[PDB]
Write a protein that binds this ligand. Structure first.
Ligand code: ZN
Ligand code: ZN
Ligand code: ZN
Ligand code: ZN
Length: 259
């Protein structure tokens, strides 16, 4: 098939893609990346992410407030998210890019958690899965997911961590986003985790332009690199490549309803 991969997490509204959407989508397509899910980071970017999803067939969107942009989120940002969701753009498939991140001298962790729960409530209200960011916060994030029990669950994107942390998310019904992290065998033991998880729990992604793959550092990551992440995933798994490719597509469809 021409569309063999779905990058479930690409910040396509940021540079180098902004203003170069046509060429970027063709580079993605020729690599077999046929659809891309674009999660927002803050209310000020909702319009441009919605415009991408409405104007380009391959792009789908998620709206939400990223923990990395905590300083920009106000009660007005949350009201904007709710009103946007109420109008249901349609190619909007998740409440996303929400989560926790303990990086920094003062991550304002309590406020991050309150903000995450406000958005988890919206995902429940509008019956949508969530696209989650978690950096050094897997245990805490799992504690909140277990408590709030979202019927549509979601994906913990760009996962890097222990087998127990991954399995706990999978046991709560969440998927695991597989990106550039698996191309660095000496950076963590995430490759061993991904090699062991059930195939139905995996989604493919890049988190482009961030998370450059091994051997491509120093320049922006791009969605076509999902094809390369896939090649590495095949080296880790026992299943044949065609079975893995089909599973990632089916998993993505089951979670988001993106063909
Ligand atoms: Zn083909
Ligand atoms: Zn993230
Ligand atoms: Zn909570
Ligand atoms: Zn992201």
């Amino acid at each position: 098939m021409i569309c063999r991969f779905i990058d479930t997490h690409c910040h396509f509204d940021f540079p180098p893609f902004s203003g170069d959407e046509e060429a970027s989508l063709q580079r993605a397509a020729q690599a077999g990346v046929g659809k891309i899910i674009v999660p927002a980071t803050e209310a000020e970017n909702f319009a441009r992410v919605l415009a991408l999803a409405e104007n380009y067939q391959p792009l789908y969107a998620a709206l939400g407030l990223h923990p990395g942009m905590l300083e920009k989120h106000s009660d007005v940002s949350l009201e904007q998210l709710q009103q946007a969701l109420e109008r249901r753009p349609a190619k909007v498939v998740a409440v996303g890019e929400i989560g926790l991140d303990l990086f920094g001298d003062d991550p304002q962790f309590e406020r991050q958690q309150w903000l995450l729960d406000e958005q988890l409530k919206l995902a429940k209200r509008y019956d949508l899965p969530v696209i989650l960011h978690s950096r050094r916060t897997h245990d805490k994030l799992a504690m909140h997911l277990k408590r709030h029990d979202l019927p549509r669950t979601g994906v913990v994107h760009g996962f890097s961590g222990s087998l127990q942390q991954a399995e706990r998310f999978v046991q709560l019904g969440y998927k695991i986003g597989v990106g550039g992290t698996i191309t660095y065998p000496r950076a963590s033991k995430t490759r061993d985790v991904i090699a062991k998880l059930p195939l139905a729990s995996l989604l493919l992604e890049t988190d482009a332009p961030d998370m450059p793959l091994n051997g491509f550092q120093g320049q922006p990551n791009r969605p076509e690199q999902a094809a390369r992440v896939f090649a590495v995933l095949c080296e880790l798994r026992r299943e044949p490549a065609d079975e893995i490719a089909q599973a990632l597509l089916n998993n993505t469809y089951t979670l988001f309803n993106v063909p």
